[PDB]
Symmetry: C2
Subunit: 193 residues, 2 copies
């Protein structure tokens, strides 16, 4: 009962695992083989049973969620510097940047974009270690709001430049056009979660 | 250049590297770091990197290698999984249990106190290329996994995960710091690491 799936590389633990744990717990006789993937455009759709990606033609696509990247910093960073009042002042701050959000393409409530390609104080190919550096007070970062809700809630991380964000991207489940019963049970479970 | 370029092992970076790295960046705000978590460090080109942290030894004569730590993988499961099944008492009983496997521990090579070696190649109920999501499924009581002890020591102390087959364990793997035999920023980093440990 093996299902082979691909999931967004940074979002998998916080966003997909409760759903996947729920499914496995309900269907003990089904194996899941998971691959976290940084860029699903390079996948061969025929190779997988279901693909979860962020961002949007022989495949069935169904939106299952959304995520909005936001700028944040710890309270001790905020207290040690004047925080930026407009998006240009980011050039004067320590930046912390994680793949795939390395080239920041920020956007405000009126559609204009400010592009920031400053070299971060800290750059990594994974966002979890960038969050750790941000929590330690080493600067401002651009981070999916869902990965950091626990810290936003009590102000361990605080939102800076609240009128700005990355353009929210939707999250999709994709699969191909019979179809084994293991795959459709899983698709249906995802749609109902 | 305007940065130090370092490579670190995939599953362990957050736990074993970031405290040191955050303390260094804290002390040298003028220094920039670019970090890449890495799965197979035998495929890296040393000249491409300022410093390389890796699991397991290397034989490169152009590199200085310093042991900065070690990890040992152990078998665990949640109390809910344990209280729902009779637990195994020899490593051969793993075949009849739900297994959760994450790279680079898709192969379980288990030694006991007396020296017997058992290899487990069964497909898990859940298999993943990362160990953090494997741990999450273990905590939810979906079965037995093999996990680097440093990643679950708070779970063991608290009792949220339990050690199973405590007479069995993988052999320890060491973590090394590698660097060529040097820019000042890289030199300052290496001394911080040694003085940290």
């Amino acid at each position: 009962g093996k299902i082979k799936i691909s999931t967004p590389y940074n979002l998998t633990k916080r966003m997909m695992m409760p759903m996947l744990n729920g499914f496995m717990s309900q269907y003990p006789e089904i194996n899941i083989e998971l691959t976290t993937e940084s860029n699903a455009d390079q996948l061969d759709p025929t190779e997988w049973d279901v693909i979860f990606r962020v961002g949007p033609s022989s495949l069935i696509a169904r939106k299952i969620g959304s995520v909005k990247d936001i700028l944040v910093a710890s309270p001790e960073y905020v207290n040690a510097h004047p925080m930026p009042t407009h998006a240009e002042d980011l050039h004067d701050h320590f930046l912390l940047k994680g793949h795939p959000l390395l080239k920041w393409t920020l956007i405000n409530s009126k559609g204009e974009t400010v592009v920031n390609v400053d070299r971060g104080r800290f750059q990594a190919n994974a966002l979890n270690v960038v969050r750790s550096a941000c929590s330690e007070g080493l600067g401002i970062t651009l981070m999916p709001d869902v990965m950091i809700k626990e810290y936003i809630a009590d102000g361990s991380l605080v939102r800076i430049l609240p009128d700005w964000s990355a353009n929210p991207r939707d999250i999709y489940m994709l699969y191909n056009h019979h179809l084994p019963e293991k795959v459709r049970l899983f698709i249906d479970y995802v749609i109902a979660y």
